[PDB]
Amino acid sequence: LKESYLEESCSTITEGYLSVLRTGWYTNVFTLEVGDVENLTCTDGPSLIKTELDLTKSALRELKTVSADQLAREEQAAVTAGIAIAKTIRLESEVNAIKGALKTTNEAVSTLGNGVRVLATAVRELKEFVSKNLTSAINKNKCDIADLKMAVSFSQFNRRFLNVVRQFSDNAGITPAISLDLMTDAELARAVSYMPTSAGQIKLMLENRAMVRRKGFGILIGVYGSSVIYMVQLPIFGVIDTPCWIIKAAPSCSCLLREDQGWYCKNAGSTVYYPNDKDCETRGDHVFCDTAAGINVAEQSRECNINISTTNYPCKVSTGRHPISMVALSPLGALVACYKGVSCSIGSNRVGIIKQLPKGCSYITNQDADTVTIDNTVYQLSKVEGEQ
Amino acid sequence: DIQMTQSPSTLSASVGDRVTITCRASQTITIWLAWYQQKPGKAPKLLIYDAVSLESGVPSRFRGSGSGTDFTLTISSLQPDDFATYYCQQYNNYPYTFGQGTKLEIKRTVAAPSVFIFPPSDEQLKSGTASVVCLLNNFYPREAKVQWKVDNALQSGNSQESVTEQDSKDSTYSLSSTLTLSKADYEKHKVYACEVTHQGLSSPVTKSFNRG
Amino acid sequence: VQLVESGGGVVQPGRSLRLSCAASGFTFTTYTMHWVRQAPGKGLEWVALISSDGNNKYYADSVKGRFTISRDNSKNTLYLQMSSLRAEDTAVYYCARGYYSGGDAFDVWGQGTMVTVSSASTKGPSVFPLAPSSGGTAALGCLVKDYFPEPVTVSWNSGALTSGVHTFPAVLQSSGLYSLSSVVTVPSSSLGTQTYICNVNHKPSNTKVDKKVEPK
């Protein structure tokens, strides 16, 4: 990457970044089949299988609760549009049409009555064990069975389900991310594939599943007999490898600081601005930005990087009366504003101070620095381009 | 880096108790966290990945809870196996950082240390170095402060301490302070005192010896 | 289903050392692998990761520039090439497996192998008696000073006397040498009647010695 400092304005510009723009949401509806547990009873007394059966029955009882708690949250940013999706799939019609679509195959595309298409996935392993292997030997209504191997298989097969309940119970129906028990690695792989974009975008998302899980989330539909229904909204990064640049600034004092700080990515030649820090997130030299939280700015805005006194675009630099000393760290360096008259020093991690800095603005690189210190507070240099 | 702050550093509880250790990240780490159980001399054992998800083989007494920056780990019924050191770890981004650790000690009723002082051996004196040993035996809890005073004059930086692991039966600790100087330096002052303060003592207890 | 580390030992500062980690029981080629180290007494510290294929390797700022992680999926082995070793790098080094793609929780660890970067060289311990002091019972012991490296093994009456024994963890002094004390509490009515001998052993030094501790 190239990072160049602007003596005027006391800002920086790190160019050479490559976009990964979240342009849409893919919807993956899951059916976690449990296998009609509550029809099985434990009359043998205390037993290991009886502990595991109560755990599963207590789990969906609590899951039926958490759905009930957040349906009552209806009074009347991408999640608020995502529960609207969850509204249409919660009906008994869609659930049945979804379960019917998955009777034959473990995964298929189901066309919703609302004119949309979601991916339907079936995780049957729990119900398959509860019906074929479990309910056969416990059919006596006595759980103190001889095969201890069955109780340990019960613990292994129901773990994914128990964790999903814990996941939805703690976050009250909507997780902040796609976890390993919401979707496995393989289930994630099939979903991103099914997305409507080309091979390059599929390749990058498959190489960066951790960003897919990060920006994706999940909503709980509810229990329908022995079927935990929940939807997972996966991000669709439909535009990649476009130019991006970050311009972070310190107050230059005589006193002004640059208000159009933050991330900028081009999409189809139209430059777009990401003011908030959580809109964009970086992995190496790639910038994952939220398209929805984006502001289309005119391309004349790159004039703030040659001379701000250019009346082709109002660069909207802001002014303050009381000068404030600050340090805004950039990815490939640091800009230190030291206008109040304090001791300001560049340092290293095993040599100590390298040079004392003057009163004002001065840009530093990691090539000849590792820290920057004012007073007793020290700022460790790093590539925190994810900082605003 | 993301700084992982665990609390408390030490937690003392008994069998059957519920126990909550909290982890705190300097930045938001969504739900990417892990809780490890490490026993002395053994590799860490993963307990719960993500925020709340349980690993295969982990008992159900272990519970996770957290989103963003503040996470907890609650052991609902302490078994004798559960007493170890617990760590949290973020994996939001590299470098992957761990917490300070939380030592889950068993609680027992307070015991004051039995203090003993040991003059430097004659063989060690013939070699030219004099190390005086102070011994705090079977006390609870581990918090203890040992100060050396030579000729009623306090010493600093010339001693180093060492602590046992919690006894399997006593559930107590023992501590050993070893003040070290040369024979020539040893032979210019007469009283050598070991001042001990610990919450099992009403007042600091001092144990000393006059050489000769 | 196990990982096994190898290559740890004692070296001088500035030297080099190669740790290897043998993987078995799982599809090693699929998993992203890590090295995590723990200094004596201290907590855990991740150092390096390497992806399933090897295109992406990352290191902590401490070992960055000196250590190099590599893998050979053909022999199911993980490597770490340590150069410019300082005394801070003294630690137990575990290789660990990443849980899932993007989720680097460590679900499988190895035994760990001990690496000791110290400028001192092999030397046996000087054993000095801790003559009994006291009431009701009495305390004695053996100070085992100035040895390198760890460990020493202290017995009492050749393993016959075990109750009340407290062998403290070693402390490495400013000298760069380890030193400990091993104490025991005995009844007083028996100090003259019963004899007490500590049997120290330091295998890197082959310093096998017994010293009888007596009332002064």
Short mmCIF file of N, CA and C in Angstrom, two decimals, chain A residues 253-257 318-324 340:
data_model
loop_
_atom_site.label_atom_id
_atom_site.label_comp_id
_atom_site.label_asym_id
_atom_site.label_seq_id
_atom_site.Cartn_x
_atom_site.Cartn_y
_atom_site.Cartn_z
N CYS A 253 -3.03 23.25 13.53
CA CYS A 253 -3.29 24.41 14.37
C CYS A 253 -2.34 25.55 14.04
N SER A 254 -2.89 26.77 14.03
CA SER A 254 -2.11 27.98 13.75
C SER A 254 -1.56 28.61 15.03
N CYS A 255 -6.15 26.75 13.56
CA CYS A 255 -6.80 25.57 14.12
C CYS A 255 -7.95 25.07 13.24
N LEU A 256 -7.77 23.86 12.70
CA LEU A 256 -8.77 23.16 11.90
C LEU A 256 -8.49 21.67 11.91
N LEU A 257 -9.53 20.88 11.65
CA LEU A 257 -9.41 19.45 11.42
C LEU A 257 -10.37 19.06 10.31
N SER A 318 -13.76 21.72 9.21
CA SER A 318 -14.32 22.32 10.41
C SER A 318 -13.23 23.00 11.24
N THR A 319 -13.65 24.01 12.02
CA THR A 319 -12.74 24.86 12.77
C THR A 319 -13.09 24.87 14.25
N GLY A 320 -12.07 24.91 15.09
CA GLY A 320 -12.26 25.00 16.53
C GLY A 320 -11.45 26.14 17.11
N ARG A 321 -12.00 26.74 18.17
CA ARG A 321 -11.34 27.90 18.78
C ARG A 321 -10.21 27.48 19.71
N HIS A 322 -10.41 26.42 20.49
CA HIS A 322 -9.39 25.96 21.43
C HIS A 322 -8.60 24.82 20.80
N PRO A 323 -7.30 25.01 20.53
CA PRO A 323 -6.52 23.93 19.91
C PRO A 323 -6.35 22.75 20.86
N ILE A 324 -6.57 21.54 20.32
CA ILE A 324 -6.48 20.30 21.08
C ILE A 324 -5.34 19.46 20.51
N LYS A 340 -0.59 22.13 22.04
CA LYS A 340 -0.81 22.72 23.36
C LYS A 340 0.48 23.02 24.11
#
